[PDB]
Amino acid sequence: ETKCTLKSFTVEKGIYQTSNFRVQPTESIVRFPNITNLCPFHEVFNATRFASVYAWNRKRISNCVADYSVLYNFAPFFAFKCYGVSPTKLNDLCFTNVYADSFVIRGNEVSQIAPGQTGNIADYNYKLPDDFTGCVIAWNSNKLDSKVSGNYNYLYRLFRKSKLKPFERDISTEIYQAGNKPCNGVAGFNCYFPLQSYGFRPTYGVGHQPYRVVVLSFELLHAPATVCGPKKSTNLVKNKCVNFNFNGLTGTGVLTESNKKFLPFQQFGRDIADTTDAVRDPQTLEILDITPCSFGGVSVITPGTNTSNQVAVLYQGVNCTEVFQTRAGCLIGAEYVNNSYECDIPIGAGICASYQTQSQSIIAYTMSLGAENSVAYSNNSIAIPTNFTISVTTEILPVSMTKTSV
Amino acid sequence: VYADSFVIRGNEVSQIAPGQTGNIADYNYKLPDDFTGCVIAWNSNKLDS
Amino acid sequence: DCTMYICGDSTECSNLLLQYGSFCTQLKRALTGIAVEQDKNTQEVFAQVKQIYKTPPIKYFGGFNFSQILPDPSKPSKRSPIEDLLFNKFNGLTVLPPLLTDEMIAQYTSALLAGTITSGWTFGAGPALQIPFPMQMAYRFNGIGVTQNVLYENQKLIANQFNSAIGKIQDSLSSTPSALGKLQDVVNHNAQALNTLVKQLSSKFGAISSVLNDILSRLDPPEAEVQIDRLITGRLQSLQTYVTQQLIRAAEIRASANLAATKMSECVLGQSKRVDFCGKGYHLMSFPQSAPHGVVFLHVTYVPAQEKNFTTA
Amino acid sequence: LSRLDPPEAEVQIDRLITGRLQSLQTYVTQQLIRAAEIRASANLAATKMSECVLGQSKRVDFCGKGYHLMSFPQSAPHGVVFLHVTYVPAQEKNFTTA
Amino acid sequence: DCTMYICGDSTECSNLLLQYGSFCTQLKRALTGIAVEQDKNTQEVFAQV
Amino acid sequence: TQSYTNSFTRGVYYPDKVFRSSVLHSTQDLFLPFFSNVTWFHAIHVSGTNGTKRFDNPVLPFNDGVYFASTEKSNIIRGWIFGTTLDSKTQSLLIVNNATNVVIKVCEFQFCNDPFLDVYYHENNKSRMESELRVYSSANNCTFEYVSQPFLMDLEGKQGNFKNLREFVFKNIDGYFKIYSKHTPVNLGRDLPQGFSALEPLVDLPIGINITRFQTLLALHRSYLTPGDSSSSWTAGAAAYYVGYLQPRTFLLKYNENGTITDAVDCALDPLS
Ligand SMILES: *[C@@H]1O[C@H](CO)[C@@H](O[C@@H]2O[C@H](CO)[C@@H](O)[C@H](O)[C@H]2NC(C)=O)[C@H](O)[C@H]1NC(C)=O
Ligand SMILES: *[C@@H]1O[C@H](CO)[C@@H](O[C@@H]2O[C@H](CO)[C@@H](O)[C@H](O)[C@H]2NC(C)=O)[C@H](O)[C@H]1NC(C)=O
Ligand SMILES: *[C@@H]1O[C@H](CO)[C@@H](O)[C@H](O)[C@H]1NC(C)=O
Ligand SMILES: *[C@@H]1O[C@H](CO)[C@@H](O)[C@H](O)[C@H]1NC(C)=O
Numbered sequence A: 001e002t003k004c005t006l007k008s009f010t011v012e013k014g015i016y017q018t019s020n021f022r023v024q025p026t027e028s029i030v031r032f033p034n035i036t037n038l039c040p041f042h043e044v045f046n047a048t049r050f051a052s053v054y055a056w057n058r059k060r061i062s063n064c065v066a067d068y069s070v071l072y073n074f075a076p077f078f079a080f081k082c083y084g085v086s087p088t089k090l091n092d093l094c095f096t097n098v099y100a101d102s103f104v105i106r107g108n109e110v111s112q113i114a115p116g117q118t119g120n121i122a123d124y125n126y127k128l129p130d131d132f133t134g135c136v137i138a139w140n141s142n143k144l145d146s147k148v149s150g151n152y153n154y155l156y157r158l159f160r161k162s163k164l165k166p167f168e169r170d171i172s173t174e175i176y177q178a179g180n181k182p183c184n185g186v187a188g189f190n191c192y193f194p195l196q197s198y199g200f201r202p203t204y205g206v207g208h209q210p211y212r213v214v215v216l217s218f219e220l221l222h223a224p225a226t227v228c229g230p231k232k233s234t235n236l237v238k239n240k241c242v243n244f245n246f247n248g249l250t251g252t253g254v255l256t257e258s259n260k261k262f263l264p265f266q267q268f269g270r271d272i273a274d275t276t277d278a279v280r281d282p283q284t285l286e287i288l289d290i291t292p293c294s295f296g297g298v299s300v301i302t303p304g305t306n307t308s309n310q311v312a313v314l315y316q317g318v319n320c321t322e323v324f325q326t327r328a329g330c331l332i333g334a335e336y337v338n339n340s341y342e343c344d345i346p347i348g349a350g351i352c353a354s355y356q357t358q359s360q361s362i363i364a365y366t367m368s369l370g371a372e373n374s375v376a377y378s379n380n381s382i383a384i385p386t387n388f389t390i391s392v393t394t395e396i397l398p399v400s401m402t403k404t405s406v
Numbered sequence B: 001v002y003a004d005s006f007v008i009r010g011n012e013v014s015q016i017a018p019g020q021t022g023n024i025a026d027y028n029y030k031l032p033d034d035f036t037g038c039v040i041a042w043n044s045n046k047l048d049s
Numbered sequence C: 001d002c003t004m005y006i007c008g009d010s011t012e013c014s015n016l017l018l019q020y021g022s023f024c025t026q027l028k029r030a031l032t033g034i035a036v037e038q039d040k041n042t043q044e045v046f047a048q049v050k051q052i053y054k055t056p057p058i059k060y061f062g063g064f065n066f067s068q069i070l071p072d073p074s075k076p077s078k079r080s081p082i083e084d085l086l087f088n089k090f091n092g093l094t095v096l097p098p099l100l101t102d103e104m105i106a107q108y109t110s111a112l113l114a115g116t117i118t119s120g121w122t123f124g125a126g127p128a129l130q131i132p133f134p135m136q137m138a139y140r141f142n143g144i145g146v147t148q149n150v151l152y153e154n155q156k157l158i159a160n161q162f163n164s165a166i167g168k169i170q171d172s173l174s175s176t177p178s179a180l181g182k183l184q185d186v187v188n189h190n191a192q193a194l195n196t197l198v199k200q201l202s203s204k205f206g207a208i209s210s211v212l213n214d215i216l217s218r219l220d221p222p223e224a225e226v227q228i229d230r231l232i233t234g235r236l237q238s239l240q241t242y243v244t245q246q247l248i249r250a251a252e253i254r255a256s257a258n259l260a261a262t263k264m265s266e267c268v269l270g271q272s273k274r275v276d277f278c279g280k281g282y283h284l285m286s287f288p289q290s291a292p293h294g295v296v297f298l299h300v301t302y303v304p305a306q307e308k309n310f311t312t313a
Numbered sequence D: 001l002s003r004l005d006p007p008e009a010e011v012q013i014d015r016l017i018t019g020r021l022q023s024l025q026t027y028v029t030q031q032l033i034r035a036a037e038i039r040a041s042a043n044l045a046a047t048k049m050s051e052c053v054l055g056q057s058k059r060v061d062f063c064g065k066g067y068h069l070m071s072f073p074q075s076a077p078h079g080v081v082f083l084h085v086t087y088v089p090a091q092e093k094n095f096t097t098a
Numbered sequence E: 001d002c003t004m005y006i007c008g009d010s011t012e013c014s015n016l017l018l019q020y021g022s023f024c025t026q027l028k029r030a031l032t033g034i035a036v037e038q039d040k041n042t043q044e045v046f047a048q049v
Numbered sequence F: 001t002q003s004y005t006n007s008f009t010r011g012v013y014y015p016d017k018v019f020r021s022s023v024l025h026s027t028q029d030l031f032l033p034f035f036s037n038v039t040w041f042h043a044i045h046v047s048g049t050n051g052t053k054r055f056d057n058p059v060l061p062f063n064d065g066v067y068f069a070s071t072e073k074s075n076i077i078r079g080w081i082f083g084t085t086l087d088s089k090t091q092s093l094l095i096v097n098n099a100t101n102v103v104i105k106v107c108e109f110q111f112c113n114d115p116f117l118d119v120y121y122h123e124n125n126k127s128r129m130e131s132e133l134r135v136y137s138s139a140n141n142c143t144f145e146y147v148s149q150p151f152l153m154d155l156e157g158k159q160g161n162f163k164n165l166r167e168f169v170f171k172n173i174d175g176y177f178k179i180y181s182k183h184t185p186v187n188l189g190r191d192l193p194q195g196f197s198a199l200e201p202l203v204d205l206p207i208g209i210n211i212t213r214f215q216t217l218l219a220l221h222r223s224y225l226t227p228g229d230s231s232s233s234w235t236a237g238a239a240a241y242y243v244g245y246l247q248p249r250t251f252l253l254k255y256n257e258n259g260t261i262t263d264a265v266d267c268a269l270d271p272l273s
């Protein structure tokens, strides 16, 4: 790595920085509020008096959640027809509003809940828009909607005046007029009832037994989000570099118990540097401290290419329990000796390495600031030299550099 | 203000722009690179054709 | 580390940055040069003595008092009271520790004091030669045109004056609002630069958001390429501004450290005939003391007073 | 140029220009700092020459380590080299003073 | 001062300048650091008495 | 009646709950500027045993949020009307309180002010007032609904000295009508006391509406402590009902070591500020 960074096949004495050691997350978690609290979705499905197709039961969904993982065990769910929205990718989506209508139909009317089709029933009873996004679920209902005499409690219009705009209601009793006789109220010849008997029986085979179908109307237009999914839940790991995904949070770190005093309502945590460090999970309503994942510039300590090939690594500023330990970091490949020498390769706080035969290896030690010397100062003691030495030192100084005129 | 009027087609009017070429911006008529103006198009299928 | 600061834990961001040329190798090279220069500065300033000297076990210097500047063994750090008073008064941005720890900078300082009180300036030139402190004070007086005549005749008086000045320098350092303005300002400048660099991460830089994950999830790499490139170039510009300001600040600190090294080589290891260099007035002695990222000189100077007028020819 | 027409090449060329010019800007800015570093040493060398060479300096540990005697300049590639002559004493001896 | 220099009298240009963060409060601090230093230079050179 | 007073230092609310203990964070949000004029609005519908029609309750415009404060015994003010023109031509929202309930609802009522004033509304003679709601007389096309806990948890300290003060801030930033509140019953009669108190959010709901109209409804079946005078041109008159208009301003808030806001310094107020 040192040869790769410093482009040369010979590496001289000196500490070299090559890359940065970075712990990686070992797994991913995600946690949102406790359960789904009280979404009234069950009341729509768990019922006995489903509204018919002559007047659908429109319900506003703004106090519920998009948890599409708990509503499946309330019906046979034989048919799971879905529109352009992905049934698998329903939890992540935050629908601004959901408009659902519950009604009971027959087997041949299953295709009537579909945009861009032609026929009779949905042209009189339940009109769908061309771009009707969402999902529709159909299941058998012969268990409840069956009478040995006749189940004439669900009705449907059959001879409305004309076609209607998408999602329009025309619930109004009227004498149906079609022909040259405008019936004045008797409702006799050429005047048949717009509503028709819509009973059910158990003897009828496949395609005629009553079916209950519900619809979902979504809106993916950019708007404030109301209905959102809890993304199920994951176990809350602690003291391990992971990928936390709390409410409105996406980062990595180590989650530890917090000794802070978050006042009751809380969103996040911050610091003077505007970084997230303290979060709370609604599943437990407890405060968690976030520490950035351990990192540090790895460094290579080498005695020079023309002395050896052994090297010592100096993971910097990391307690690499996550071999020697220093204030600058932990040294691996060099054994700490308790002696002292003038150090030729600085490492950190007082620690320097060297290549010694103490069978030669790399040894790290505390710097020797110099040979110990104690003067003999006294009240009346003086040292006067009797000899000298004309020593010629040397001093080198740059004076100029290469002029450039790009 | 210079108003340059001509009739080409629905497809070709899509390349009345600097740089982009539909064999109309290299031999017939091209729009200058620093054009600071406006372009207006409308259908003429009912006309002639 | 450019990759972690600019991009963090992203692969496409690192791949895109790998094109912006060697704008990293240059950054790391400049910062490592600054770090090496900083580690060397203390070497020139303090490591002016080949041998660590120790004071005699008995400390009597002819009446002069040095308890306030020599190390006190009672404290585990082995620091002088004045040095103790001076000492008392996470996105890839690593802070390397200094090579010379503060427990051995104090040892260089103690060696310098021992040499300058027990050997005069002789240990600055060659081998340390013992010399009684009154004789050294006579030497220093003779160095400013005042003969040895009036040192011994005032030895007790000068000793009392020096002891009083040493005693009151601690009070001057303490009761003052802020005398350590330069060191504190250097530390504050570094902290402010780092804080500004960190706070620059949460900057849109003309993009939709300052979060790389947010700018990735809401788009696809083709369309998000422009936004992520804008964020990369903005953060790179911020890093370049930081490193250039760091280079200029380090040049200023290098000039200051060269000045301090010259001050130690002249004021401490000898007597300076320069005027107003080693403190106001004629210069007698200088005592160094360590301080967090700096040095403090006690310039013992000679100031006349109580002048009388006369007729001359 | 031969692979793309003006309109998107103009965008691409601007990307190269704003990179090369900014890279050139960094070189000059980094070159100015080095020039200031050299002048600090060059001015020190001029001061060192005017005292160590053309005279004797009383400044301790400036013109060589120890008592200074004289100096000799020697030219070097992009710099100067000094030969400080010094009077380091040796062979001390204890004595009794008063 | 950035605000007027970069954007003469534009409120919406000032809003776009806010997106660049501390490129200006850092810049203004750098210039005022030189300004106060200049008064220190003349203070130190001349006021020796 | 109406009068004018000074806001002093009040109406500071947490914009978001990013816990930033001991941080001098600054934000440019909607706020009540320090020392701003606040208009005491009052309603006077009571006179002995006769009718004495009111013609009171003037119009209160709503712009960029509003700060409201009051001191009421139990439910003196129970109605809030938020909707342009207050008719069946523009969407409207109503916050209606109860003993322990709230009737927050979006609809298009023509009229909803039928308090059914008691002829015997003399509090000093009788204090019975039940089932006098008489709201939602007309509704054309109304869909949005909401019910939750009430807004004001009034506390009784066994005496009238505990003059509890309730403060609320209503702003309409892309829905989520935040109802920041704070109850400080330390007051003993002082109007808008010196000091500082932060407001914590309670609820919100997104609809999307250009509400520029503000109004409040009283417990009119039991109306008293309402005096009248000619208070005008910077005067004072008992109202027990404050109101102030927020502006987009820069504030610098100092978070306590615990987490709460000890105090905040305004910008563009004083050169020192
Ligand atoms: C003469 O000078 C020498 C050193 O030049 C002194 O020798 C050392 O003195 C110190 C201080 O008393 C002792 O701790 C060492 O043990 C001495 N070294 C040796 C090898 O003995 C010496 O004390 C001086 N005086 C005399 C009378 O010799
Ligand atoms: C010495 O003593 C003082 C100054 O120390 C001289 O008196 C000053 O003389 C100047 C001009 O001659 C006046 O401007 C000052 O006001 C005087 N000061 C005082 C305190 O009187 C004095 O003349 C000098 N010579 C002698 C012989 O005393
Ligand atoms: C290093 O070693 C190789 C082979 O041992 C030798 O060829 C080369 O000259 C050596 N380099 C130095 C600088 O000694
Ligand atoms: C650092 O590692 C040492 C090694 O034993 C351990 O005792 C200490 O608790 C660790 N501290 C931290 C903060 O990890």
Ligand SMILES: *[C@@H]1O[C@H](CO)[C@@H](O)[C@H](O)[C@H]1NC(C)=O
Pocket (backbone or CB within 6 Å): A336, A337, A338
């Ligand atoms: C080296 O010295 C230390 C200092 O006490 C001692 O603990 C250790 O046993 C010695 N020997 C080693 C490290 O081999």
Ligand SMILES: *[C@@H]1O[C@H](CO)[C@@H](O)[C@H](O)[C@H]1NC(C)=O
Pocket (backbone or CB within 6 Å): A378, A379, C060
């Ligand atoms: C120096 O003189 C002092 C005077 O009290 C005495 O205490 C001390 O022991 C003497 N030291 C030597 C080495 O003679």
